[model samples]
Target chain A: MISEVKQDAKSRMEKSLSVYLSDIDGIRTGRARTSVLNGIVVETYGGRVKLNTISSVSVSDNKTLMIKVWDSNNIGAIKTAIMNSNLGFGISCEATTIRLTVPDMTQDMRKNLVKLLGKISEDCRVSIRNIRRDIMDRLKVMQDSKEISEDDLRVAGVEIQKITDDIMKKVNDAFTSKEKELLHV
Target chain B: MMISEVKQDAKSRMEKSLSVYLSDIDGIRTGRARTSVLNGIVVETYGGRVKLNTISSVSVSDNKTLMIKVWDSNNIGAIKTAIMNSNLGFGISCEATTIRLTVPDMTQDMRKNLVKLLGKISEDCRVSIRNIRRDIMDRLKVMQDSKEISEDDLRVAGVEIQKITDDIMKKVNDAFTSKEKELLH
Candidate 1:
């Protein structure tokens, strides 16, 4: 039973570290996504409006897309913004909707994108490490008050590092997959 | 040994990336808490009567100290119109409850508030880099895959990260030591 308790405690700490990785994956990048457009808010009709409300957009093909508007009147302003935006995808307006075809990137563009993703990943990892450091402090307070033995203190330290490493792995793995997707023909 | 350890791996990954930083610590600044407002929402009943419902409001009084009100009064039509017509924060009110926000600052208030929050000093950056990036968990996978890490090594790795977190936590303490910042001028 004592060994079982130790195993459960170890497992809990490891699990805590794993969540530290998911935060890095939550950022938006150039891709086929409804959420990728979340940060893009446009000024319209005297207020900020989400682009989705003005139109219906979906990835039409492998690197192509379409936008269908409920009210076609908003299409012109939408098209103008898309062209000016970082999306840089060429857009054509149809009678019912607008179609956006994502152009193939130059080699430099792809390299820049990878760098951007890497930056985001590193920042998030730094953040997670910060969290790990905070928790360890609490554990030490426990040790100082004689709640934990030196062995337990030492053991907890090891567990935290495992958590940190695991999280970084998930981030790199995710970055690799995204890089592959971007590089794929 | 590997099979026994494998059960917890999936759970650990999910637990990674949590921001253990106390995000709201430096949230309020340059203010006197004259009113111990819980920032709770009050619903008007029949005229002078008021009730507090949980979902009716949210408040962060660390700013302008002025109370902002959004209401869905007894009049149903006005409530619906107010809810829909404008996309303001007060828009979503119904006859049931109103939102009253008490903010600390308006213009320069936001900037000062942000500066106050950046006042964190922690060695977590070094610890996080060392634990998460330097001896990252992905390395552990390679170590495990290549049979460089025995069952003992994997167990030891888990304990190591926790120690790093503990060392970094002292810095977290220094960062959050500004609790008095909220109290006085």
Candidate 2:
């Protein structure tokens, strides 16, 4: 019972950290990457399709993403979608393709991006903490109900906190590097 | 057993997956005023079909009431129509400039249905977590075959992964029980 509760808490904590990573992946880092346009939906003839579905996105260089649409008809609609999506990318549409140039971040914009990054990571931290709390609550209930030994509970409590600390370290490490990348030249 | 990175990865993935389940269920109304209940509802505007969130800002004043302040007054009627059409069974009144929704108390039948719905959702999440576990175990087996990790390591990791799965499974069950309790009484 002790190990079971500890394992559950650890897995959930890890899950929160992974979510934080993906959530921040969408946040722009001055350099262009295909992941930044992940959730942008374009109204195509079929329906509202993911931008990447109808078009192939590739990083032409550090500052640009070149999107080659499968259908020429989608160029206008794709351009409109990107412009309206407000991802802050400058789009130049041609006959069959669109190029999105990620502008250089100003100091103020970098500060704001960092703040957004901090907020996302903070939410992730809270999620991890909540998972910890849930596990602890469950453990206490088990102990009260005499389903687990007091010695086992104490040991499991220490183990759960250790896992939580490790997960938090992972979160902090990811955040610190991303912050550096944003603030770095 | 020593903690392997794969175990950590799988645990984190499962944890993240469970978090999504919780959020999705949280959006399920249990005789309460939660703005999240309006999450996927979309309102048709002069421009296009916009998400309820985008068209207006929804706030919960109390447990039974929600106030939607539309950014454009023109969208007031459209928003109300969308809410009515959503079939989430909400009672709405179009105020002078805003729209109000009063969540009705759940009937015995409605509560039963909600309990069933929660069960279905919980089952799906458990299946997803199992699938994640399967994938991780398969990967570990492959690693063992390739001599990347020893058989002992593979065995240990599998046990650890299963333990994590059981832990998350417990958490999911608890969440469902609490949600069911909320609806039932």
- Say which candidate scores most in DockQ: 1
Tens-digit lDDT track of model 2 for B1-185:
11265688678878876886796466455776777778878788887888888778889988789999988898888888888866556778877778888986666665665566677667767766775676566555534433345788788888888899999999989998888877765
TM-score (C-alpha) between model 1 and the true structure: 0.43
Compute each candidate's TM-score over C-alphas: 0.43, 0.49
* Model 1 per-residue lDDT tens digits across residues B1-185: 13223224322322232133332232223343323333322433444424332222334444444222334445334333432332212213222344333333323543343333334323433344344433344434433433334667666765665554444554455554554444434
Each model's Cα RMSD? 19.5, 21.3
C-alpha lDDT score of every prediction, in listed order: 0.47, 0.73
Reported per model, the fraction of native interface contacts reproduced equals: 0.11, 0.00
Worst 10 residues of 1 chain A by lDDT: A1-10
DockQ of each: 0.06, 0.02
lDDT of 1 at A118: 60
The CA lDDT at B38 in model 2 is: 83
Question: What tens digits encode model 1's per-residue C-alpha lDDT throughout A1-185?
Answer: 12322343335444433443343232223355554444345567788788887777687776667778777667777777676554456678759778776555566655655665565456455555556555555444334333356788678678767766776676678767766666666
- Please give the lDDT score for candidate 2: 0.73
Q: For residues A1-185, what per-residue lDDT tens digits would candidate 2 score against the true structure?
A: 36545677777676657756764555566777888788778898868989888999999998999999998988999899887664557789777889999877767767766765666566566667656655665555445433456887788888888888988998899988888878877
